[PDB]
Amino acid sequence: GELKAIAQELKAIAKELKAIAWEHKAIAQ
Amino acid sequence: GELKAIAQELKAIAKELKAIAWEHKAI
Amino acid sequence: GELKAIAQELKAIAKELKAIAWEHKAIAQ
Amino acid sequence: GELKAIAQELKAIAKELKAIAWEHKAIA
Amino acid sequence: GELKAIAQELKAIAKELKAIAWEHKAIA
Amino acid sequence: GELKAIAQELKAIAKELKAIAWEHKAIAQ
Ligand SMILES: [Br-]
């Protein structure tokens, strides 16, 4: 379904944001 | 429901953005 | 309702991007 | 209604994204 | 539509995100 | 459909995020 595909994109977005959040944390040494 | 699920992913999103807002406040 | 839930999480999202905007604004000024 | 409320939050999100971009450009 | 309107704001979001990556591309 | 249109913008959004994500990594290096 298209609602399911919408959740899938939101999920991929969340993990990209997860990674960036981690970079900032790492970069904060 | 797939709307509930959509909401969950937005919740996770706000969680990461919050973490990011902080690490900026932390640098 | 579930659409309300979605709108509420987008409000929260908009908020964090506001905070992030301010921190960047800070770095500049 | 609710779909409207969603568009207006998106709008607000777009606006804040634009604010961040401006601040990036403004460092140099 | 309202759905149509949501897509336009999401399109606006994509655009601002693309501007952020451009400034970042300038730094990096 | 309009839902597919929405899912496609979310796909475009994930892409730019991904690029920004790779920008932060390059700085980390
Ligand atoms: Br950023």
Contact E2, D7 (CB under 8 A): yes
Q: Which residues contact C22 (CB under 8 A, 6 or more apart)?
A: none
Q: For residue D18, give the DSSP letter.
A: H
* Residues 6+ positions from F6 with CB-CB distance below 8 Å: A2, A6, E3, E6, E7, E10
The answer, yes or no, to whether B and F have at least 3 beta-carbon pairs within 8 Å is no
CA B3 – CA F28 distance, rounded (Å): 37
Q: How was this structure determined?
A: X-ray
CA–CA gap between residue F16 and residue C28 (Å, rounded): 23
**Cα–Cα distance for residue pair E5/B18, rounded to 1 Å:** 27
Q: Which member of A2, A3, A16 has the closest CB to residue F14?
A: A16
Q: Which of F13, D20, F5 is nearest to B13 (CA)?
A: F13
CA-angle at F13, arms to F29 and B26, nearest 5°: 45
CA B12–ligand 1 middle distance (angstroms): 18
Report helix angle F2-28 to E2-27, nearest 10.
Answer: 20
- Give resolution, Å, one decimal: 2.5
Residues 6+ apart with CB under 8 A from B20: A17, A20, A21, A24, C16, C20
Distance (Å) from CA E25 to ligand 1 centroid = 12
Neighbouring residues of E16: CB distance < 8 A, sequence distance ≥ 6: D14, D17, D18, D20, D21
Alpha-carbon span F22 to B19, nearest angstrom: 18
Q: What single letter denotes the amino acid at residue E1? A: G
